[PDB]
């Protein structure tokens, strides 16, 4: 539900660009290593405004001369989870903290407390946790509670930044699986900014590379990750499976296409070896 036509803002000039993102998709933004540039995401949202033309996101269309008055409906349509979302738990009980969002935008208080139960259940917790105070909760449980709280606005486009930072492999796996299940069931379009390439390789539909604030590529991961030399310029890299596939190819074997995830390489090798017998 995102469209662009050479109209974005152009500090060193950021060239105007054109792009489009289908609905119920997955946009992964492997950005500049030194800085993830949450400001660049803020180029249209929150304080910083865009210029040099019009932007269109679902019903709301951002004209070049749109002021902060029109930004209020945007807040109730795009949800973003800041890095370390455990720093914004201030409220006596989990139920009340979860409902702070909808109550703020203005809902029936009892209705918000009602949505609290369902949204807590969604993130896979127990209702007994409802009464406990956040500060006495476990580590990842605080993050999951915050995620539920932001999720409680029933938005349609979700912005996630470095979700799996400061966890163990099991925690990262579970968090990404939760996001994938939400994507496939409830129908939200999730935009991701992260460093680990395996998550981008598996759970993604369209990628983007940004270097010092300049979109210099777009499309599917298959096309983007086939120019190794290009990415090394911007301190980026490729999936381990890409390294293994290149090593095997240089040894004297051929494949129709680059295997991105280990599963693709495994299937290619399996079929090829089975042919030889």
């Amino acid at each position: 539900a995102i469209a662009f036509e050479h109209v974005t803002y152009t500090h060193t000039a950021l060239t105007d660009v054109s792009l489009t993102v289908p609905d119920r998709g997955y946009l992964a933004i492997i950005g500049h290593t030194g800085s993830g540039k949450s400001t660049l995401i803020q180029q249209l949202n929150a304080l910083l405004k865009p210029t040099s033309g019009t932007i269109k996101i679902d019903e709301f269309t951002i004209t070049p001369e749109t002021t902060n008055a029109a930004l209020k409906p945007l807040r109730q349509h795009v949800g973003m989870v800041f890095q370390f979302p455990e720093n914004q738990l201030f409220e006596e009980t989990v139920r009340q903290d979860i409902a702070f969002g909808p109550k703020n935008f203005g809902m029936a208080d009892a209705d918000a407390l009602a949505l609290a139960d369902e949204m807590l259940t969604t993130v896979g917790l127990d209702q007994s946790y409802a009464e406990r105070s956040p500060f006495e909760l476990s580590g990842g449980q605080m993050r999951r509670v915050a995620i539920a709280g932001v999720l409680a606005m029933q938005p349609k486009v979700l912005v996630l930044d470095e979700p799996t930072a400061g966890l163990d492999p099991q925690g990262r796996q579970e968090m990404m699986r939760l996001f994938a299940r939400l994507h496939q069931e409830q129908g939200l379009t999730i935009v991701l900014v992260t460093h680990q390439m395996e998550d981008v390789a598996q759970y993604a539909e369209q990628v983007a590379v940004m270097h010092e604030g300049r979109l210099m590529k777009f499309g599917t991961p298959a096309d983007v990750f086939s120019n190794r030399e290009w990415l090394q310029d911007h301190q980026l890299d490729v999936p381990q499976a890409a390294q293994f596939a290149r090593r095997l190819r240089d040894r004297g074997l051929t494949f129709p296409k680059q295997p991105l995830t280990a599963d693709q390489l495994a299937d290619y090798l399996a079929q090829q070896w089975a042919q030889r017998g």
Binding site: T33, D168, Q170, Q235, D237, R247, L248, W273, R276
Partner: protein
């Protein structure tokens, strides 16, 4: 070699009515080694790390480092030979400039200014941090703070480097750089280094895995023998390396590869010779 660190019958509770965190920890450490304490979250290993330096007051058992047995009177003597880097890289600075931080350790131990500058300069130049000496602390990269702390602990000249979790907050490149720097330091000055870990790479370089679960020694082996427990290694506290990824993937698709652990080169040669023959 004489066991530098001796630990036996360690049971402790940082809260009186909480479940047993550590229970009868029994292990030994030689000199010039690289250990690895890996376990799933909630089992409790950070407690072991903190106890090893005589931080939390324990009751049962006795720990001995460099001959001296630990008592609540010799802790200051013990801490001289023990150094560690903590989890968050933003909550370990004490000064207003990197030079002040790297000096702190030397200042703490009564010493003279006239001799200070050469030592701090050598320490800063021994980790490739010289060019950032004068700038403020809240401007470095996330891993650069860890590198500065490493420089300081190198300056104090200890023998044991308890590498508590220091690779979760950083990004891949910083992790690789820190691993290389600690490799160089160990190779040069013969430092025994323990490591609390979840990432594969640091464990791979080590020489002894000491899996701990529910405050108990459940296993101990060589890295090679422990990187073979299929999926349960995920529950163990690590992430299976790419070799194990392909290993497991091939089995489900109706092909049986070898059994023992292999690196990139071994799998490369195995597949190449197996296929190219036909």
């Amino acid at each position: 070699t004489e066991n530098i660190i001796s630990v036996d019958h360690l049971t402790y509770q940082y809260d009186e009515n909480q479940a047993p965190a550590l229970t009868d920890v029994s292990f030994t450490v030689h000199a010039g080694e690289w250990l690895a304490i890996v376990g799933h979250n909630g089992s409790g290993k950070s407690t072991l790390a903190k106890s090893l330096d005589g931080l939390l007051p324990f009751t049962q058992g006795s720990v001995t480092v460099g001959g001296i047995t630990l008592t609540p009177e010799t802790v200051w003597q013990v801490r001289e030979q023990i150094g560690m880097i903590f989890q968050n890289p933003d909550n370990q600075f004490v000064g207003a400039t990197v030079e002040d931080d790297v000096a702190f350790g030397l200042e703490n131990r009564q010493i003279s200014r006239d001799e200070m500058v050469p030592r701090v300069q050598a320490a800063l130049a021994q980790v490739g941090m010289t060019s950032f000496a004068q700038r403020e602390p809240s401007s470095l990269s996330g891993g650069q703070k860890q590198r500065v702390a490493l420089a300081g602990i190198v300056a104090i000249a200890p023998k044991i480097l308890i590498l508590d979790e220091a690779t979760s907050m950083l990004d891949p490149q910083g992790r690789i750089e820190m691993l290389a720097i600690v490799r160089q330091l160990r190779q040069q000055q013969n430092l025994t280094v323990i490591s609390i870990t979840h990432d594969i790479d640091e464990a791979a370089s080590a020489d002894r895995v000491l899996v701990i679960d529910d405050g108990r020694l459940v296993d101990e082996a060589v890295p090679s023998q422990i990187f073979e427990r299929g999926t349960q290694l995920v529950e163990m506290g690590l992430d299976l390396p790419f070799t194990e990824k392909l290993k497991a993937a091939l089995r489900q698709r109706g092909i049986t590869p070898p059994t023992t652990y292999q690196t990139a080169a071994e799998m490369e040669e195995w597949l190449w010779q197996s296929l190219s023959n036909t």
